[PDB]
Amino acid sequence: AIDEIKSRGYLLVGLSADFPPFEFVDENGNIVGFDVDLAKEIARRLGVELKIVDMTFDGLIPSLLTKKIDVIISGMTITEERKKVVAFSDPYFDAGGGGSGEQYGIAVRKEDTDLLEFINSVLRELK
């Protein structure tokens, strides 16, 4: 999947911009937050531009399945229910401390193994 992203020259990140401080619409109508910063970092390390695709939270996994987006970065908890349908990165945010309670992950189509391997490398570098 990385060859095809690099060929297009952009990364399509799905989120729901109603969840400060992770993703929200600021006073200038721009989508900003921790997750936008992480999306920007991943796009930069792939050498591509970023397109944030804003939608409803319940629309995110459907959009990823239908290939409208490369990944979800949207305060999405890693759950057993969501692992039935998508792959997650290593956690990038631990709500509770010491790996306790909600851990946020980046959702990737299960087929896109190279992209997942690369995102996990980036998260280790950001840590």
Q: Give the C-alpha separation, 17 to 125, whole Å.
A: 26
Experimental determination approach used: X-ray
Closest by Cα among 80, 106, 83 to 93: 106
Phi, psi of 59 (to 5 degrees): -85, -15
Q: Give the C-alpha separation, 108 to 1, whole Å.
A: 10
> 26: which 2 tokens?
């600021």
Closest by Cα among 80, 81, 73, 126 to 104: 73
Strand stretches in the chain, DSSP E: 10-15, 18-19, 23-25, 31-32, 49-54, 71-72, 87-88, 93-94, 103-104, 107-108
> 35: which 2 tokens?
């997750």
Q: Give the C-alpha separation, 86 to 78, whole Å.
A: 10
Closest by Cα among 61, 49, 38, 52 to 5: 49
- Under 8 Å between Cβ of 82 and 61: yes
Parallel/antiparallel/unpaired status of strands 71-72 and 10-15: parallel
> 58: which 2 tokens?
């319940």
